[PDB]
Amino acid sequence: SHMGMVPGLLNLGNTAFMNSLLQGLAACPSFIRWLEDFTSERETQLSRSLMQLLKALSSHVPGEDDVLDAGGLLEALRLYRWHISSFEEQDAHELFHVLTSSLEEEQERRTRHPFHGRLTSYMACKRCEQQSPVHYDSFDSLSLSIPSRPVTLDQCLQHFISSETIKEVECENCTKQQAGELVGEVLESQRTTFVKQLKLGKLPQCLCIHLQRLTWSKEGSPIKRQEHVQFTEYLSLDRYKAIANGVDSEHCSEYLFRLTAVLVHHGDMHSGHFITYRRCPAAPRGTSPFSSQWLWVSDDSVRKASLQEVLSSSAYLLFYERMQRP
Amino acid sequence: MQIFVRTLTGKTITLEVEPSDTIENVKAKIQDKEGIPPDQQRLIFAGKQLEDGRTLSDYNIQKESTLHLVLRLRGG
Amino acid sequence: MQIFVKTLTGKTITLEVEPSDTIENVKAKIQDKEGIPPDQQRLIFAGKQLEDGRTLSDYNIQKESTLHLVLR
Ligand SMILES: [Zn+2]
């Protein structure tokens, strides 16, 4: 039995990347609610099978099955959306983007899914101080590079939104304020120094933070960052706050998030395992909309875990729910 | 036309492209600047991961668009 | 220390081990937890078949390393 807990998931052939992600998504009740609304035949197998699994993985009352078979979802993926081989290891983050995009594609075939946010992208030429049109880009996750004394999530966020200077950037303005040269006459296209900066625009109800543990060495080889990145149960994003997705559009603690799951990669740059720390399903009569109890889940194996253990882990994907506005 | 790629250190580089360029082409240009083999690159634009065989034009990727470069960390 | 053993038949096992533990010891622990006889067990790490007389440290098997169990 799994009395105070949740079902595990069969590993269907190196599919820890799917099981860990499912356990994480199951701890995001807003995403589940969205999918429920959404799911209310091959073309919709992905969303239906995902819905069935998340529902079975988010039930306060224990279900009939200790371990679930995610075969309908894997099948829908491999056959219809993401043509991966049967026994190859994959990146849970890459699966995450496959799912959000596939679900949005089922949708446009209506509110956006709750992981969806927007970044603001500002840039200006240092030579003429002309500001470029603002880009408002969708995001489904924030992929943070880890800076190089311990590293904190806040330092990663800060690095993400910090301004930078970029050289040899085309500026049409400075190109036209340029005198031509008598050679015929040639007008050299002016490339200048720009300041650029990303800021958090619209914040999602469900937040997926992706810590980039896989990078590239100076010697030209992949390397995995193993070091702890210090993160907290509660994350305030107030600090980190036209063209939209490429299309010209129109434009005319408050942001407090509570951690609900931590997906962890165990292994090196080439392979390994994924496990998930997650909250227990919400109870009907809790004093909070969330359970204070945590679980550790490795495919079929489920156990209780302490928040200490959670916070001390090597986070790869972090999942949060936005807490109701003040 | 010029677009931006946010690299693995969070530093943003420029790329010189055509709307007709394929994602494979773009990945080749990124390899030219960063030394990362195209088959190890994942490119994301406006939260969508770009796929080989499509063009920038297919994705409405315009001048000064920002692509995000991430690698693929496997676990099974 | 903890390591993982992925099987091909849908269970992923957790093991409590020491770097000094031999492969024979690990197979013994797998037998104790899953009832699988050591003579049926084949362990794989980084595409390498582990041999009984050796230890985990010999193969550079670290905390939370993943082994694959395949049966003959
Ligand atoms: Zn200028």
Curated annotation (Swiss-Prot), chain C:
It comes from the Eukaryota. Phosphorylated at Ser-65 by PINK1 during mitophagy. Phosphorylated ubiquitin specifically binds and activates parkin (PRKN), triggering mitophagy. Phosphorylation does not affect E1-mediated E2 charging of ubiquitin but affects discharging of E2 enzymes to form polyubiquitin chains. It also affects deubiquitination by deubiquitinase enzymes such as USP30. Mono-ADP-ribosylated at the C-terminus by PARP9, a component of the PPAR9-DTX3L complex. ADP-ribosylation requires processing by E1 and E2 enzymes and prevents ubiquitin conjugation to substrates such as histones. Residues 1-72 form the Ubiquitin-like domain. The record marks H68 as: Essential for function. There is a cross-link at K6, K11, K27, K29, K33, K48, K63 (Glycyl lysine isopeptide (Lys-Gly) (interchain with G-Cter in ubiquitin)). The record marks R54, R72 as: Interacts with activating enzyme. This is Ubiquitin. The gene is Rps27a.
